[model samples]
Target: MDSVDVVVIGGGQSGLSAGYFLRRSGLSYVILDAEASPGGAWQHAWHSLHLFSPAGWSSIPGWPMPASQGPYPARAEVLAYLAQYEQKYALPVLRPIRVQRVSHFGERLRVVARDGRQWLARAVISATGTWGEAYTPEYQGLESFAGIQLHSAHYSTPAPFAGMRVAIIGGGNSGAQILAEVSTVAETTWITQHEPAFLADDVDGRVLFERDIVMVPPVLDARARGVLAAVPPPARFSPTGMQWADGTERAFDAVIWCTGFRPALSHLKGLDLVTPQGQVEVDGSGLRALAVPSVWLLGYGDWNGMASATLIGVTRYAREAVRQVTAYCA
Candidate 1:
């Protein structure tokens, strides 16, 4: 119920970086995280997930993610980095607080949590990220399918899926990564709308972590062995399996949807700023919401900031958002 200069509605990378900047801004602020603990959405990522972008490019505003012993840092390493980053900076974060919505009243904004907690702030930064809004497109007869269906977000490891005929849908980095690992034990098929694009070799062991797909050792090796060949999705799903467009039906044990996610902005619905595109439009710097100067959308995607979704890139966007907050609250 107390008031603050800024109420950041996420304790993930973007929110923590904003906290780093705000700490020196002399502004009072609080970060509200929905999760029970730290690491933000990174904690929910699949076990095979790795930040192949290298520890060099996986830094926060003031802290660098420690180097990993492997070729790339795994999910656990990144999660630990996030936890340590929050501690290193001593960010003001309240966990297990799920913010329901943000309502504006005159110059002050009310951040209301689902638990009835509220805070009045001069500005609100939404770093909620996209992990919460997993997107799985509806396939024909999808509901009637008898096999197990799980989105990549819910997928963890290849252990339980061993020896099963699994279908991996989507062509992004995650789809390929999961397919690579799962194929090691399970009979797998890669499904995509079009051929997955591959990034050219960086001429080194590292990868260019731009907005491209997930590139890791598994995916790379799979690519080398020519195991990541993808097929266009079937016409629809059957009660037991898939019915291909060519009228071929195959019984499958499971389907892993790597279709991707939408930006998690339900908390901002109270403001009516979300466009028909299911996103809140932002200003040129991709920080402040175009319609609300005091509101910011950070680390969603390119619309938010170039590379903003990356651990290293989010620091830039978060700093920019906090600077805007400083000016708005000044």
Candidate 2:
């Protein structure tokens, strides 16, 4: 049986950072990633997207992001940084290897792949991030429209919507961001199942400011925070957060569902731990409470915590996890 001291199931910033610390501590480890290459969720995002965060404000433990002036860095740039990180840290990652399931029994961990191969590990860390799968609410009469039908995931360029009536559905960040991108493409009609935010035009500029702000760090310091803040409170929507606007109906040529995503736990079927919406529950414990010994419910959606899933928070998560593993190893 193929085995390693530690098996990191993701190669994203989180998994990579964790692997860096593990290697530094002299722990034997290997990374099994699903993608053909190392760029994690960034590889799957809309190509036109900027980081919604600036450089320097983002980083992994050993490597720093390359310098950039604006409040947001392009998505491609983040992918490039991730590529450099793997080389710089020499993270032992096996690209294109999809980890189908990770099960722990006694002191051994069983890691099975999609092709039914198995790799055993003394310990495992699942670092899959938020881009598991985009969930879209199906609207009636969706097939009737003759223009085009696609999810936000396939939305890359505005050229497709040119001169067409484009309808962007959803009122959250993804919908909002896409709406902004497609404004000049087609006769844009942004629709929301609920209310949507009309961010202050200056929000991005403020994050780009050269000063500090509230308990929340500088906007540029963390991309998600800065971008979210720049969006006015009036524009925010929710399945539960805050009812910005009552439910409404609208139409368009193409509808992009900006709704969020769920964890990809298809392999954990018999476990009965995941929610109907795909939230994971390991060993009958709450998300915040640690139940599985070494398996982590990482990158659980952005709203999982105020800062727990952010670029800054992952470091603490790694530190705490290491501390626990250290005690166990001892």
Candidate 3:
């Protein structure tokens, strides 16, 4: 079995950031990624997609992205830049190694790959990102729908739905982005079980709007749904609030589900840290309890802001978390 002092899972921005820290910490580690290359999640985004934030916000640590690239980094540029990040850092990551399980035996973490290989590490950082699994809701006859259906995760470009009526489900950045993209392709209708909210940035600060983003399944337990409703709304929504339970069902040639995502931690077993919602529980930092000693979770919570999870988010998250890890190691 291969062994290392630390094993950073998922070679996306977060994992790479963590690996960067571990390297500077003088800890021997390996970054294991499922895809053939890094930027696991970003690689899956729409081909024409570009980040709203500029290069200043998206620059990775130790390396600066070119200003020639616009404030909004496109999907292909992001993907190419991520490759540069891995090379510039010389991060020791094994691509195409799809980690299957992370079982704890006594004092060590045993990481199992899909091909019956086991790697032992003292600590693990899971940076698989929320997009590891696409979240889709079930309708009575969704499978029977004659129209084309695909999740926004699989959506790479607008060419597929050109000139067709499209219905986009869910209310998040992805949903809004898709709606905006489809508007150029065909007549589009957006549906949401609840009102959607948006988080906007201004010159002075950031503001969460009610119309831009949406909250879903507020209650992990069905009984707690009522209890959770008592809390204040997280953000403001667009003028049109989806008050109906079933929502307004529109007939279209396609349905693009953009519901949010959950943690993809199915491998870690016997760990008593997951919440009832199946998400890893963390106080503030993204650390999972009992994940492994000396292991830190970056980008788990709202580290800094929504941007912290983005590529721009990764650079800031890396600097901040590395500082924290360094201080802790000290």
Top TM-score model:
1
**Which scores better on TM-score, 1 or 3?**
1
- Mark the 10 consecutive residues where model 2 has the least summed lDDT: 211-220
Candidate with maximal lDDT? 1
lDDT of 2 at 158: 76
| lDDT tens per residue, model 1, 1-330 | 799998988998888888889998989999999998899998898776877677877778877889898867888888888899888888899999999989987888998988798999988988899999999998799999998999999999899899899999999878988899898888888989988987764532234434345556788788787778888889998999999888998888999999988889998885888888779887788788888888888889877787787787788788778877888776
Compared with the true structure, the alpha-carbon lDDT of candidate 1 equals 0.84
Off by over 4 Å in 1: 202-211
Candidate 2 ranges with C-alpha deviation above 4 Å: 69-71, 141-146, 198-251, 282-291, 302-305
CA shift of 27, model 3, Å: 0.7
TM-score of 2: 0.78
Give the per-residue lDDT of model 3 (tens digit) for 1-330.
Answer: 887777777888788778677777866778888897667788788766666555555666666665645546566776777788788889898989988888876677788999997888766666777777677765544555677778888987889899998777776667766776666667766676565544323321112210043221111121132221111121222222222233433456777778777666666545554556656654354453543544445554353234546555565556555565455433
Model 2 Cα shift for residue 33 (angstroms): 0.7
Segments in model 3 whose C-alpha atoms lie over 4 Å from true places: 198-249, 269-273, 290-296, 300-307, 315-330
| lDDT for model 2 | 0.61
